[PDB]
Amino acid sequence: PFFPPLYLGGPEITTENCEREPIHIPGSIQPHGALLTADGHSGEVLQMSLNAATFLGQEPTVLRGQTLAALLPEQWPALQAALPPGCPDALQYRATLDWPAAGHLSLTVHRVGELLILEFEPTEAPHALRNAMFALESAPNLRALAEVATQTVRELTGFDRVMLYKFAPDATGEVIAEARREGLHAFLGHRFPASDIPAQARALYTRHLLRLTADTRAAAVPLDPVLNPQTNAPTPLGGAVLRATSPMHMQYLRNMGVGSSLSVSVVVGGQLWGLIACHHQTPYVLPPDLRTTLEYLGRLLSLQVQVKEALEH
Amino acid sequence: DPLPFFPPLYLGGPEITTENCEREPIHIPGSIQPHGALLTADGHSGEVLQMSLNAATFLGQEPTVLRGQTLAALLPEQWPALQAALPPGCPDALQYRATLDWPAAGHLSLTVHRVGELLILEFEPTEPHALRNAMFALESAPNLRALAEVATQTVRELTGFDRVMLYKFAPDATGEVIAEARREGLHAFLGHRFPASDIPAQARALYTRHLLRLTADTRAAAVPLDPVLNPQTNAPTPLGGAVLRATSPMHMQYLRNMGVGSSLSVSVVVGGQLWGLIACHHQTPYVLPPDLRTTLEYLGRLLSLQVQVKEALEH
Ligand SMILES: *C/C=C1/C(=C/c2[nH]c(/C=C3[NH+]=C(/C=C4\NC(=O)C(C=C)=C4C)C(C)=C\3CCC(=O)O)c(CCC(=O)O)c2C)NC(=O)[C@H]1C
Ligand SMILES: *C/C=C1/C(=C/c2[nH]c(/C=C3[NH+]=C(/C=C4\NC(=O)C(C=C)=C4C)C(C)=C\3CCC(=O)O)c(CCC(=O)O)c2C)NC(=O)[C@H]1C
C-alpha cells in the first residue's frame, strides 16, 4: 500500500520505506507556478496554492469564492467540452491567457473525478522539431538513435546533461547515451539500483509522461486547504507537473550537484522502456512551449525505439 | 502481375493506360507543381545544375545568373547547415527545413534532401495549442473507431479541407474508408471499398518511405525541370522525396472526374507496412502552407503509434 502523507501524520520516509512514500499526494507544488482546484460542475474554486496572489494578482479571498465562469469567461466552456466527466486523468487541455497582471500565462487543466486541476505558469509569444523528427527516423540503429535523441534534446534545451536511461527487465537502470557540457562527470555506461526510482514512482511515470524539479533547493508551496473539501481527502496531483517533488529525490539531486532536473518517459508496449533524463547545474524553469516539444519527442522516440528494436529481433 | 517501370515519356516511354498502370515511373516525372520552385545542386561543390522553369519568378533572378553561382554564394547562411544536416551517404528520406527571408519573394520555406551526389532544394512561400490538445485526445480515445473519428475531425479542423477520411488497406491492398469528416452536403464514402489498383503497387511502395504527397490544383500544368536530365548522370532526376513532384496524369484524371480540386494524404505506417492513409479532398484548388503541413506530418507519426496501441488492445 502507501503510508499516509506527512501532513496527515504518516511516517517520514527513509531508505527502508522508499516504496511507500505517497509522492502523488504531497499537498504542495513548486513555486514557479500556481495551482487552483475547482468543482467540475459549478466551476467553484475549492483549493489554491498559497502563492496564487502573486501570479494571478488577486486579493486572496477573492479567488476562493469565485467561479471559473467568472474568473475565466472565454475558457470555461472549452474546459467543459475538452474534459468531459469520466475522462482519464491523463487527458490535458492547454491555453495561453493574456492576463492583466502577467503578460502571458500558460494554463493546463486536467480532471480527476469531480475536480478540475488548473496550473498556471508564465509563458511567451521553429524547424528544429521537424529536423529532429527526420533525424531520429533515419538513425540506422538503436545506438545511433539514442545518440541523436540526447544531442537533439540538449540542443533544444541547453540542459547541462541529457541522458537516455534504459530499464533492464528487473528495473535496473543503464545510461546508454549521453550528451553533456564539457567538464561534467560522464554517466555513460553506468548502472544504478532499482530503488533509485521506486516502483511507485515508475507506475506513475507510465501514465504521466513528464516531470521536473525546477530548483532542487526551493521550498514547496502548500495547497490551502490541504484536503479537498469535496472528499475531505488529499487532492491527487500526479498528473500535475507543478507537483512538489519528493524530498528524498531532491536530496539525491542535491548530493549529485544538480540544480534543475527533468525527464520524459519512453513507453513501449504499455511498459516503461526508459527515460530522457535532463540535468542542469543551476535552477532552470523550462517554459511550457519548449516542454511540449520534448513531450512530442517522447512519443516519436517511443515509436522509433519499437521500429529499431524490431530490426534487430 | 508486377513488372518493371517504363522509361518516362521524355525518354520515349509509352503513354499510360489502365492496362500498364503499375509500370508508370511516378517518381521521375521531370517536372513539378507550379506553386513552388525546385533547384538541384552538386552535393560536394554546390554547383546549381537543374531548375524548374518558373524558378526566376520565385527567386527573382535570371536562370543564367542562378546557374552561374554555387549554393555557397546563393545561401551563405544555410550552405554549412545543409552540409552538416545532410552528410554524404545519408538516406533520401532525411529532410532539412529552414525559413529564408528572400528580397523579392517574402518568407520562403526551404526543404532540402540528398539523393546520392545530388541536393534537391524546394522553395515555397510560407506564412495555438491545437496540436498538443489533439495529441492528448488521440491518446485518450477508447478504441480504434473513436481514434479514427477524432483523427479525421482534428485534421479537418486544422486544415479546413472539405473531406478528410481514414483509408485503411486490407491484406489484398484493397482499401476501405473507415472514418471521415466531411462538409455539409457531400455524400458519404464511409464503409465503401475500393479495388487495389486504385493505388497501384509502386505508389504504395513509395508511400511507405515518403509519407506525404499532395496535388494542390488538379488542373494545373506541371513545370519542367531545365534541363530535364541530371547533367551528372545524363539520367532522370529522382523526385520521389520532393513534395513539389508532379502527380501522375492518371491519378489527376481520377481526381478531376470525382470533382476534386485539391488532394493530400499522409501515410500511416505500422510495423514497416503501409497500414492506411489520412487522405484529404477539397473541391477547389487549395495550397496548404508548409508549416501547417508539418502539423499533419507530426499527426501521421502519432497516429502510427496509437494505431499500434489500439490494435494490441484487440486480439
Ligand atoms: C527511498 C528511495 C530513494 C529514492 C526515491 C525517489 N526517486 C525518484 C525519482 C527519480 N530518481 C531518478 C534517479 C536517477 N537520476 C539520474 O540522473 C541517475 C543517474 C545519474 C539516477 C539513478 C530519476 C531520473 C527520477 C525521476 C525524476 C527526475 O527526472 O529527476 C522519486 C520520485 C520523484 C518525484 O516524482 O517527486 C523518488 C521518491 N531515490 C533514492 O536515491 C533512494 C534513496
Ligand atoms: C492506371 C491506374 C490508376 C490509378 C493510379 C494511381 N493512383 C494513385 C494515387 C492514389 N489513388 C488514390 C485512390 C483513392 N482516393 C480516394 O479518395 C478514393 C476513394 C474515395 C480512392 C480509391 C489515393 C488516395 C491516392 C494517393 C494520392 C492522393 O491521396 O491524392 C497514383 C499515384 C499518384 C502520384 O503519387 O503521383 C497512381 C499512379 N488510379 C486509378 O483509379 C487507376 C485508373
UniProtKB/Swiss-Prot annotation, chain A:
PAS domain residues: 20-88
Processing and modification events after translation: Contains one covalently linked tetrapyrrole chromophore. Lacks the cysteine conserved in plant phytochromes (at the position of Met-248) that binds chromophore. An engineered sequence used for X-ray crystallography forms a thioether link to biliverdin through Cys-18. The natural sequence can bind phycocyanobilin and phytochromobilin in vitro, but the identity of the natural chromophore is unknown.
Positions of the GAF domain: 141-305
Disulfide bonds: none
List of residues binding a tetrapyrrole: C18
An example molecular function term from Gene Ontology annotations: protein kinase activator activity
Phosphoprotein recorded as keyword: yes
Keywords: ATP-binding, Chromophore, Kinase, Nucleotide-binding, Phosphoprotein, Photoreceptor protein, Receptor, Sensory transduction, Transferase
GO biological process entries: detection of visible light; osmosensory signaling via phosphorelay pathway; regulation of DNA-templated transcription
Functional description taken from the UniProt entry: Photoreceptor which exists in two forms that are reversibly interconvertible by light: the R form that absorbs maximally in the red region of the spectrum and the FR form that absorbs maximally in the far-red region. Also has a slight blue shift for the far-red maximum. Could also absorb green light. May participate in regulating pigment synthesis like the carotenoid deinoxanthin which could protect the bacterium from intense visible light.
Family the UniProt entry places it in: In the N-terminal section; belongs to the phytochrome family.
The protein's name in its UniProt record: Bacteriophytochrome
Naturally occurring in which organism (per UniProt): Deinococcus radiodurans (strain ATCC 13939 / DSM 20539 / JCM 16871 / CCUG 27074 / LMG 4051 / NBRC 15346 / NCIMB 9279 / VKM B-1422 / R1)
Gene: bphP
Segment of the intact protein contained: 7 to 321 of 755
